[PDB]
Each structure stands twice: as C-alpha cells, then as structure tokens.
Amino acid sequence: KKNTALLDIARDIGGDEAVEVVKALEKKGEATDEELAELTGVRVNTVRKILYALYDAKLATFRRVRDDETGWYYYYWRIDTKRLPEVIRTRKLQELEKLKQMLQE
C-alpha cells in the first residue's frame, strides 16, 4: 500500500523514469546518482532532477561524502518513507482544495 503510493507519487513527479529510479534505489538501499543512472539507464541529469524532487517532497534524504581526489561532494541517496503518510495526506488535501476553488469560481 505504501509500496504503491510511493510509486504513484513518483509517477506524478517524473513518469516511468522516476518509477525506475525509486525502484532501483529501494532495491539498493543507498545509491549515488551515477550508480542509479547505470542501474536504470536513465540519464544522470534526470536521475538527479528526480532525486531533488523526491527530496523537496520530503520523500528522500541523502548523505554526503567528500571525494578526496577532487574535493567535491557526491551524495548517497535513500528513500525516506518516515513522513510518507503525512505527505500522501497533504497531497490529497491540496488536490481537494484546488478543486474547492474551481467550485467557488
């Protein structure tokens, strides 16, 4: 039930690619952008844009590692269902009162 609801939010976010990304992420526990682009075949710019969307929806978190050859960070993402129930609800309420204002036209 939370399995499918997560994936449905992913579809709204980014279609079949988002659903591939979420599924590979859950199967792997944690993953980098690059690891997810290779697991899935989706491009890394799009894996990344999906992940930052899941992060803004507070459905994903990450933890950062400093790559010491270059000094730049790279993220290890993971799905965070902790607040998924409140997210599912908020999205319903919001969609409902988007309808409410069309009725108040």
Residue numbers in the entry: 5 to 109
Question: Which statements did the authors publish about this structure?
Answer:
For promoter-specific transcription, RNAP and general transcription factors (GTFs) are recruited to the promoter DNA to form the pre−initiation complex (PIC). In this study, we determined the X-ray structure of TFEα and the cryo-EM structures of three forms of archaeal RNAP, including the apo-form, RNAP–TFEα binary complex, and RNAP–TFEα–DNA ternary complex. The structures reveal that direct binding of TFEα can shift the clamp conformation from a closed conformation to an open conformation. Our results support the universally conserved mechanisms of transcription initiation in all three domains of life by showing that direct binding of TFEα, a conserved GTF in archaeal-eukaryal RNAP systems, can open the clamp of the stalk-containing RNAPs.
After screening derivatives of TFEα, we found that the 13 kDa fragment Pfu TFEα (TFEαΔZRD, 1–110 amino acid residues) was crystallized. The structure was solved by a single wavelength anomalous dispersion (SAD) at 3.2 Å and the resolution of the structure was improved to 2.6 Å with a native crystal. There were eight molecules in the asymmetric unit of the SAD structure and two molecules in the asymmetric unit of the native structure. The TFEαΔZRD structure consists of the N-terminal eWHD (residues 5–86) and a long α-helix (α5) that connects the eWHD and the ZRD. The eWHD structure is similar with the X-ray crystal structures of the eWHD of Sso TFEα15 and the eWHD of human TFIIEα23. Superposition of the globular part of the eWHD from the 10 crystallographically independent structures (average root-mean-square deviation in α-carbon positions are 0.369–0.589 Å over residues 8–62) reveal flexibilities in the wing and the α5 linker. The conformation of the wing can change about 24° (~13 Å), and the α5 can be bent at ~21° (~12 Å) for the eWHD. These results show a potential structural adaptability of TFEα during the transcription initiation process.
